[PDB]
Amino acid sequence: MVEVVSVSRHDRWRGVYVVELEDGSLRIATKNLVPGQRVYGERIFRYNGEEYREWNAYRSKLAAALLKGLIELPVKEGDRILYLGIASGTTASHMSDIIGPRGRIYGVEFAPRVMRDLLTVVRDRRNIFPILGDARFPEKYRHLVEGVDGLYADVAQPEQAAIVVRNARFFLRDGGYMLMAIKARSIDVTTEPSEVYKREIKTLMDGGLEIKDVVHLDPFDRDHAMIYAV
Ligand SMILES: C[S@@+](CC[C@H](N)C(=O)[O-])C[C@H]1O[C@@H](n2cnc3c(N)ncnc32)[C@H](O)[C@@H]1O
């Protein structure tokens, strides 16, 4: 347990909590869906009789995107989410906290060894539904994934936008959100987009996604931005 001076829900990012530590320094955290359990050595706080899990933006790109000024948190209580590249569940565990018992994260991951890890991190989180499969071939898991409210993509592969569009066509509800971690330098966001970056964005736009926000993640992640589209 880390001691905290206060915990209060953020005014706009529902399910996310602003935590002030001893020294007046601040963190964000989610309310633990499985009180007593720790996913990636994150620190745990207790306040008013409830347990919170620190959401460390240096280990999760979505927390980084919020702290870098992403316009809104589109992940909501009860959402069904298709998560491409779930890995061992770091960011998904916080999505699982926010969405609560009636939400679902369908977590696609293609490496058996990473899947085993995820099964071992997420064995008591029953709103996470791991799918062993390659996100390039969503037809092979169409029978396992219902309509989703949102699509979150972090597969760390070139030409991720084509994978995103293909999955969105199969699964993403009308007006569903799409959050995509993209390899990007600060200058791609602030100055002028590189060739490879521009083409990812055009692929999304050509796929009917319209870009609502983009934030670079430095220094939480020096090499990525978060693209947000609806
Ligand atoms: C950057 S890690 C994701 C980190 C995770 N999203 C988080 O925030 O905690 C990318 C993961 O995607 C998986 N991956 C790469 N290509 C894939 C593909 N075509 N389909 C499914 N998973 C893939 C890798 O095995 C790896 O675990």
Strand partners, 109: 132
Take residue 156 and report the two structure tokens written for it.
Answer: 């760390």
Distances (CA, A) of 198 to 46, 94, 183, 192, 213: 44, 30, 11, 9, 15
Using CA positions, which residue lies closest to atom 4 of ligand 1?
87
Inter-axis angle of helices 160-171 and 195-206, nearest 10: 10
**Whether 203 and 136 share a structural domain:** yes
127 token code pair = 């709103």
Listed residue (27, 57, 54) closest to 217, CA to CA: 57
Residue range(s) defining the domain that contains residue 74: 56-230
Same domain, 155 and 62: yes
68 and 44 within one domain? no
Binding residues: 90-91, 109-110, 134-135, 154-157
Q: Do 117 and 224 belong to one domain?
A: yes
Residues 20 and 37 in one domain: yes
Total domains in the chain come to 2
User: Which letter, b or e, does each residue of 151-162 get, where b requires 16 or more Cβ atoms within 10 Å of its Cβ?
Assistant: bbbbbebeebbb
Q: Candidates 60, 66, 110: which one to mutate for ligand 1, based on the most atoms within 8 Å of Cβ? A: 110
CATH number at residue 201: 3.40.50.150
DSSP H or E run through 176: strand 172-183
Among 132, 187, 179, residue whose Cα is nearest residue 160: 179
Please name which of 166, 30, 147 lies closest in space to residue 81, comparing C-alpha atoms.
147
Phi, psi at residue 191, to the nearest 5°? Answer: -125, -65
Q: What is the CATH number of the domain that holds 51?
A: 3.30.200.20
Is residue 44 located within the same domain as residue 63? no
Alpha-carbon distance 229 to 189, whole Å?
15
Q: Indicate whether 191 and 175 sit together in one domain.
A: yes
Q: What is the resolution of this structure in A?
A: 1.7
